[PDB]
Symmetry: C5
């Protein structure tokens, strides 16, 4: 039997945080799912939104796996000990302000879950925010330097209510969230980069 | 007679900052109590408030214990040398600004006390703040990555006064403070994550 | 049958982050290209703009090279493990805010592509911004400490399109972007500092 | 012989940054003295000020001492290489913005002098700011984790001018400064933390 | 038989970044010159100014010196790998925001040039900014912890053009910059601290008559 200290030690022995854990020459399947918590500061003039969301990020790194027979099957681990996907919001206009402890969960099979609460500002369509049908702000997230042969990005469609963790005290409300998968090619390169496009359909709440 | 240096060096060689100090496979029992020192930058339209609180945080790591018959029975220790609970306010919308030195006290029996002064912005019900009944702003605080089997969160056992350390110079006054245990399951997982929900009943001082 | 872990391990052994990778006494040929993504704030009175651009930067560090005949020919690498050109915008009035992960792409032949997305404020000519012919804001980017014999700077004057990646949600639009080679030289010293002058010809949308 | 390089070397290898340098079992005598440099922003509605002060801070760490018969008797040392008292402003509402290089001065006897320029925001009484009487903003500075038996806090006895280095360009002027020894105690515990109360008596300057 | 990597490796082992390289009993002669590039927010009610400037900082460190017979006689070196004067603006009300790569130039005789673009806010006399004769904002720069006998600050005696690099797109224009020298003794300590006073005389462009 190993304790949590032994597991963490074994992870720091086999984890190479600067090396993508591809198996075969297959891409690492990264899942990304936003859970919007708040919409803080909207500007229809400048098409800018300030949003708080939980970024559900899962992937597998088999280098972290251990025997969990008579031992715990999960640990919390600082992300600086692990390879993490180099996700970027393509239409972000501020750095991500990470509000939560920078720890990820690692399961004994090597499945990793990182879920930071992030506050960030985006350039996106705010038109119609004060109308009844709302604005639809599209947020694009994928790897910054890993193309499709290295990272696949995919949404996990089991939306635990679009507006489930969303603050009831926002001035805004969510009408709909659709998370569609997408790709882009840049003439720099022959390569394509996978992204999740997250469409946030929201509006200012009416008054009685 | 061990001196403070000896006490510290023992802690350094034993403490594991990235390893939760569970006993057997029981949860680490963490205690959290917010002393409110100030309410600032209130906004009833956006439902947002800055708060300054001392976040009293107690837990035990019995491996750190020493005999304090002919030696000091407490030392100040930088938190970077200790495991510290990965606490987070679930309805924070800014990262905590830690106003005080990041030092904890380790007692010779293995009890640890970290009490940082934190300024932080929250999304919560600010309605009625200028009325007599006041507003009730609920702050949730618990482990981000450790479920109920790994970390338990409990309010401090005693009900000390609400405005005891509260700036007399604030534009607001506290009417009542209420700390209640709580526990949520999330879409990610079947396990539950414990929190203390602090209910801050406060209002603007009457013009007197 | 080398792998990504080998490639990185070898980079760690050969790479000198603080040492300019000049061959002989020939300058490190650095290529710079700004791709404008957004223009966020413009001030017609103060002559200041807040912009978002991808700064596509390429150079060669031959010490990084490896045989990729039976292994990957490219890896993503943190810039802390590489030497990076000490580029600065001469007319910037804020620190560069790097929005993206700080990883460069390294090719097996030693070629490096670093492409940060950067938000930054600049002091430049905003006159004309509210007219059809628009304003012309020039950004000067070159090495801060390495002269012409040490670093050379050149645009990637390809068939590069202006608004290809530019946000349609900006209140401004790009009319044209020309990136021309230049050299500043500062009164004191017989040392010329090469730069790219990026002329951003833009206007506010609407009548 | 024994040049500055040797002195820095010995400091670096003798210093214990995380261990208080208590001579025998008596508190570390810390001296604190704010010299006000500016009052930037003030708000009489919110009872908040933004001030700039040099924090003259002296104490002794005897282990650092060296023989300066044939060598220098004073060196500048980065505080990161030194034990430094864990001072906090109890009524601070912002992190101390240190404006100067983080170097202290070490004397061959072991006396350390650290004097950072700090810009910081405080919650204090601002009422009267635009009268002849003026306002009196009290600032409390003591150790955050070390009680009376570990750290003692005294104002420096120097009878210096109160406006001496204060900016003539500030919108405000200082009528008087009083720096007074005090302690604070909490209902949790019997231990007392010593502090200086600094009483800033200032007002808005007239055009006349 | 020596390249740039060799020069850096040798600097690393000779260089003591936390040791001022005083020679014998002399102070280290630091010379300081501000090349004003921009003047941003100005507030006359509050007497505060936001300024961008290149802080031309030069000094000698013979520990760094090497033989440049068959090697480069100058390298760019990160400032963390060498000793740097602990300069401070006395009347600054914000941390210096360094806009450029933090690299210094080292010549093989051990002469060091370090010249960050700095953006920083100051408390100084802004009254007059919207007048013909303009405002004069004084910026005092000197060592924070080294006294006259350890560091000396003297203004670059070069007869510089004041607005040589000053943005033509600024709202302000520079009338004059003058750099004097001072030696102040405070209340903590018996020794004197050298400073350069930089008087920046400037005003708004495009005023009437
Ligand atoms: C976002 N655009 C992009 N390329 N491009 O536009 O030519 N990404 C791939 C780059 C490879 C290194 O980091 C980014
Ligand atoms: C200042 N307040 C205090 N107790 N209290 O407020 O009840 N003790 C010192 C704390 C010990 C750990 O960090 C600070
Ligand atoms: C708060 N949300 C949560 N799950 N969820 O929202 O689906 N779990 C906690 C996460 C476990 C790993 O990092 C944090
Ligand atoms: C600049 N001011 C000064 N004294 N004073 O103002 O009373 N001495 C230098 C101090 C020595 C260590 O930190 C700074
Ligand atoms: C770019 N500017 C320059 N001269 N100048 O501005 O007067 N030389 C390079 C300097 C070498 C050290 O830091 C910058």
């Amino acid at each position: 039997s190993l304790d949590r200290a032994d597991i963490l030690y074994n992870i720091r022995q086999t984890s190479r945080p600067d090396v993508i854990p591809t198996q075969r020459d297959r891409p690492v399947a990264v899942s990304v799912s936003l859970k919007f918590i708040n919409i803080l500061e909207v500007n229809e003039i400048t098409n800018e939104v300030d949003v708080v969301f939980w970024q559900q990020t899962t992937w597998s790194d088999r280098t972290l796996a251990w025997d969990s027979s008579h031992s715990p099957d999960q640990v919390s681990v600082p992300i600086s000990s692990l390879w993490v996907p180099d996700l970027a919001a393509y239409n972000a206009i501020s750095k991500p302000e990470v509000l939560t402890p920078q720890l990820a969960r690692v399961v004994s099979d090597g499945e990793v879950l990182y879920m930071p609460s992030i506050r960030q500002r985006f350039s996106c369509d705010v038109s119609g925010v004060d109308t009844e049908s709302g604005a639809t702000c599209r947020i694009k997230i994928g790897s910054w330097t890993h193309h499709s042969r290295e990272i696949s990005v995919d949404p996990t469609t089991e939306n635990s209510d679009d507006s489930e963790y969303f603050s009831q005290y926002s001035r805004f409300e969510i009408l709909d969230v659709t998370q569609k998968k997408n790709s882009v090619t840049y003439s720099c390169c022959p390569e394509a980069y996978e992204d999740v496009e997250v469409s946030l359909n929201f509006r200012k709440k009416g008054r009685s």
